[PDB]
Amino acid sequence: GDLELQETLATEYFALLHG
Amino acid sequence: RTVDFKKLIEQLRARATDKAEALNTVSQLEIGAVDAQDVTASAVRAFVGALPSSGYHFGFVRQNVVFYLLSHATVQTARDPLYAAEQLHEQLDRFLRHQHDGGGDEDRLPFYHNGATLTAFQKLLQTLREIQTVIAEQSGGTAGQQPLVRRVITQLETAATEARPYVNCRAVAELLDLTYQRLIYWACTLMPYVLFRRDTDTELDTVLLMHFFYTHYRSVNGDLAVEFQNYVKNSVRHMSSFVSSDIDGDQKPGAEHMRDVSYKLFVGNLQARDASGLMFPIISTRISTVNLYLSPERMFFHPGLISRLLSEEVSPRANLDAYARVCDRVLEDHLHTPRRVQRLLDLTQMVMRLVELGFNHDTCAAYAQMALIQPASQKSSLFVSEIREKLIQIIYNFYTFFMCLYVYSPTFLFDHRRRLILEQHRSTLIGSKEELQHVWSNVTLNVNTHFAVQYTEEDFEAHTKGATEAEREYLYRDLHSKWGVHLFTLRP
């Protein structure tokens, strides 16, 4: 359940980039 | 979100003896998304073969692999919602027939089953087909009416309540969101012009309403130009009453933004443009002529007074109780709306009554940017400052509502996007300031009121009426990954 947290954090980082 | 499930099949049958690796792989497949075209009968048949164990979730997909797959598949990336969806549907039909050859029964809870999943999915595909056909037929291809709009939104809400139990699937959610975005974008502009006309309106009020209608909706309404041309010549002794000399036209504040809408009426044709940047006589934005020549309720259609009131450049001697009472009335009327989630028909009615107020999304944004452009410190009376803060309230909640309506959908993805939307709108709307605390609370209340998507705990209990202690785990995990909140705890 750690790699899924990695992917969620990466998606949040991409969302911050988009913002 | 893309994940190549073929390499996932490679991983699955490379390490089929380990349950943990298969569970991890199916987990990132669930959080990931798969193209429909990449899915064939052989593909997910090899998916089944690569994990022939049936521990808890492996068995769960043995009974309900179709529903699990459609809960995470993506179709929008390949620009073929209906086509890829139906291709996926017939290959899943092949899957269901293969399983029926293996054996067929309505095992577990009858609410969800592979055959039931296929039936629901094909019903959804049909509804998508009528949605596309009605959009194509009532838009006249690629470019009264009110009862027709009411009827069509009635069949759309019927299809919605048919598909209401199926919201927690990524493919279904994105299809529904796309359909609703299309329908809302279509309906926001296709509103008629019956309610603008009234007896107390003057010539300036009606012509300004008509400019707003033209700049807001011109797709298939081609009779406007002739009516405007006739109305210009009918009111020959009227436009000269509230117009100033061209020498002192552009110098007065607020008229610079009004020049675009003004030249449209001066030239005599909305199709004309002020490309040369020429100078034309300017309607007097001063309230001394405004109150005498137009009704106060139509002020938001008039950009000059909005700009001047936000800029606080209006003389204190000038009377402004007209828009004061008008804005108080509209604010009280719109705040008193119930907190309950308005129905799609009710949402459309409230959107069209908002449009009747002249609040256009582009106009709202372009005239709300100046509110932060305007200086914070200025010399003013009490009531003008109250009007400016109420203007901030109304305009900014309208802007947030519209920018959230364009992505509105009764699905988890709308909330997932709207949390970040609210964060960005907090960072931009308020910045580091504090005097926007109460307006921010009101805006949050409005956005959580009109756009509230609600999932019932009893709805999930029906979702898991026959599900045993095993299937709760991954269903709850998917719900948490989608919504992002620990929205219940299962303690039977």
Side-chain angles (χ1 to χ4, degrees), chain B residues 41 181 312 425 459 482:
Chain B
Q181 162 268 341
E312 197 74 89
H425 290 203
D459 275 337
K482 289 179 153 72

mmCIF file with all atom_site columns, all heavy atoms in Angstrom, chain B residues 41 181 312 425 459 482:
data_model
loop_
_atom_site.group_PDB
_atom_site.id
_atom_site.type_symbol
_atom_site.label_atom_id
_atom_site.label_alt_id
_atom_site.label_comp_id
_atom_site.label_asym_id
_atom_site.label_entity_id
_atom_site.label_seq_id
_atom_site.pdbx_PDB_ins_code
_atom_site.Cartn_x
_atom_site.Cartn_y
_atom_site.Cartn_z
_atom_site.occupancy
_atom_site.B_iso_or_equiv
_atom_site.pdbx_formal_charge
_atom_site.auth_seq_id
_atom_site.auth_comp_id
_atom_site.auth_asym_id
_atom_site.auth_atom_id
_atom_site.pdbx_PDB_model_num
ATOM 1  N N   . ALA B 1 41  ? -11.421 -10.413 -25.965 1.00 0.00 ? 41  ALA B N   1
ATOM 2  C CA  . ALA B 1 41  ? -11.786 -11.622 -25.234 1.00 0.00 ? 41  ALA B CA  1
ATOM 3  C C   . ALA B 1 41  ? -10.547 -12.387 -24.784 1.00 0.00 ? 41  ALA B C   1
ATOM 4  O O   . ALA B 1 41  ? -10.460 -12.823 -23.630 1.00 0.00 ? 41  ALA B O   1
ATOM 5  C CB  . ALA B 1 41  ? -12.686 -12.509 -26.091 1.00 0.00 ? 41  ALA B CB  1
ATOM 6  N N   . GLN B 1 181 ? -21.684 17.853  -18.894 1.00 0.00 ? 181 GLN B N   1
ATOM 7  C CA  . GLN B 1 181 ? -20.980 19.055  -19.326 1.00 0.00 ? 181 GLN B CA  1
ATOM 8  C C   . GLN B 1 181 ? -21.522 19.543  -20.662 1.00 0.00 ? 181 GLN B C   1
ATOM 9  O O   . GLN B 1 181 ? -21.792 20.737  -20.836 1.00 0.00 ? 181 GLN B O   1
ATOM 10 C CB  . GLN B 1 181 ? -19.475 18.779  -19.405 1.00 0.00 ? 181 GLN B CB  1
ATOM 11 C CG  . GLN B 1 181 ? -18.672 19.779  -20.233 1.00 0.00 ? 181 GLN B CG  1
ATOM 12 C CD  . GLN B 1 181 ? -18.532 19.368  -21.688 1.00 0.00 ? 181 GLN B CD  1
ATOM 13 O OE1 . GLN B 1 181 ? -18.713 18.201  -22.035 1.00 0.00 ? 181 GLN B OE1 1
ATOM 14 N NE2 . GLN B 1 181 ? -18.200 20.327  -22.546 1.00 0.00 ? 181 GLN B NE2 1
ATOM 15 N N   . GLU B 1 312 ? -15.130 52.800  -7.008  1.00 0.00 ? 312 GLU B N   1
ATOM 16 C CA  . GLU B 1 312 ? -15.484 53.810  -6.009  1.00 0.00 ? 312 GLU B CA  1
ATOM 17 C C   . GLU B 1 312 ? -15.136 55.217  -6.494  1.00 0.00 ? 312 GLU B C   1
ATOM 18 O O   . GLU B 1 312 ? -14.721 56.080  -5.714  1.00 0.00 ? 312 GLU B O   1
ATOM 19 C CB  . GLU B 1 312 ? -14.815 53.506  -4.661  1.00 0.00 ? 312 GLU B CB  1
ATOM 20 C CG  . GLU B 1 312 ? -15.410 54.234  -3.463  1.00 0.00 ? 312 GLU B CG  1
ATOM 21 C CD  . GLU B 1 312 ? -16.744 53.654  -3.039  1.00 0.00 ? 312 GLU B CD  1
ATOM 22 O OE1 . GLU B 1 312 ? -16.749 52.725  -2.204  1.00 0.00 ? 312 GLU B OE1 1
ATOM 23 O OE2 . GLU B 1 312 ? -17.784 54.125  -3.541  1.00 0.00 ? 312 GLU B OE2 1
ATOM 24 N N   . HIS B 1 425 ? -9.421  28.717  -6.010  1.00 0.00 ? 425 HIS B N   1
ATOM 25 C CA  . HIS B 1 425 ? -10.279 29.891  -5.920  1.00 0.00 ? 425 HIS B CA  1
ATOM 26 C C   . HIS B 1 425 ? -10.102 30.614  -4.593  1.00 0.00 ? 425 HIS B C   1
ATOM 27 O O   . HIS B 1 425 ? -10.340 31.820  -4.514  1.00 0.00 ? 425 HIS B O   1
ATOM 28 C CB  . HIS B 1 425 ? -11.739 29.489  -6.130  1.00 0.00 ? 425 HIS B CB  1
ATOM 29 C CG  . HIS B 1 425 ? -12.054 29.077  -7.535  1.00 0.00 ? 425 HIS B CG  1
ATOM 30 N ND1 . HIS B 1 425 ? -13.330 29.123  -8.056  1.00 0.00 ? 425 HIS B ND1 1
ATOM 31 C CD2 . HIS B 1 425 ? -11.259 28.613  -8.529  1.00 0.00 ? 425 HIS B CD2 1
ATOM 32 C CE1 . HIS B 1 425 ? -13.306 28.703  -9.309  1.00 0.00 ? 425 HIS B CE1 1
ATOM 33 N NE2 . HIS B 1 425 ? -12.063 28.387  -9.620  1.00 0.00 ? 425 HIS B NE2 1
ATOM 34 N N   . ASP B 1 459 ? -27.486 3.440   0.734   1.00 0.00 ? 459 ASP B N   1
ATOM 35 C CA  . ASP B 1 459 ? -27.184 3.144   -0.662  1.00 0.00 ? 459 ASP B CA  1
ATOM 36 C C   . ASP B 1 459 ? -26.027 2.159   -0.778  1.00 0.00 ? 459 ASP B C   1
ATOM 37 O O   . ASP B 1 459 ? -26.061 1.249   -1.612  1.00 0.00 ? 459 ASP B O   1
ATOM 38 C CB  . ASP B 1 459 ? -26.874 4.432   -1.425  1.00 0.00 ? 459 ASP B CB  1
ATOM 39 C CG  . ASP B 1 459 ? -28.124 5.127   -1.927  1.00 0.00 ? 459 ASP B CG  1
ATOM 40 O OD1 . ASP B 1 459 ? -29.161 4.450   -2.079  1.00 0.00 ? 459 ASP B OD1 1
ATOM 41 O OD2 . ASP B 1 459 ? -28.068 6.351   -2.172  1.00 0.00 ? 459 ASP B OD2 1
ATOM 42 N N   . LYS B 1 482 ? -11.425 6.811   -4.778  1.00 0.00 ? 482 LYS B N   1
ATOM 43 C CA  . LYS B 1 482 ? -12.163 7.705   -5.667  1.00 0.00 ? 482 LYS B CA  1
ATOM 44 C C   . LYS B 1 482 ? -12.570 8.990   -4.952  1.00 0.00 ? 482 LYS B C   1
ATOM 45 O O   . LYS B 1 482 ? -12.183 10.090  -5.361  1.00 0.00 ? 482 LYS B O   1
ATOM 46 C CB  . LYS B 1 482 ? -13.391 6.981   -6.228  1.00 0.00 ? 482 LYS B CB  1
ATOM 47 C CG  . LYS B 1 482 ? -13.060 5.893   -7.242  1.00 0.00 ? 482 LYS B CG  1
ATOM 48 C CD  . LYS B 1 482 ? -14.314 5.188   -7.734  1.00 0.00 ? 482 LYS B CD  1
ATOM 49 C CE  . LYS B 1 482 ? -14.119 4.618   -9.133  1.00 0.00 ? 482 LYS B CE  1
ATOM 50 N NZ  . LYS B 1 482 ? -13.230 3.425   -9.139  1.00 0.00 ? 482 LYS B NZ  1
#
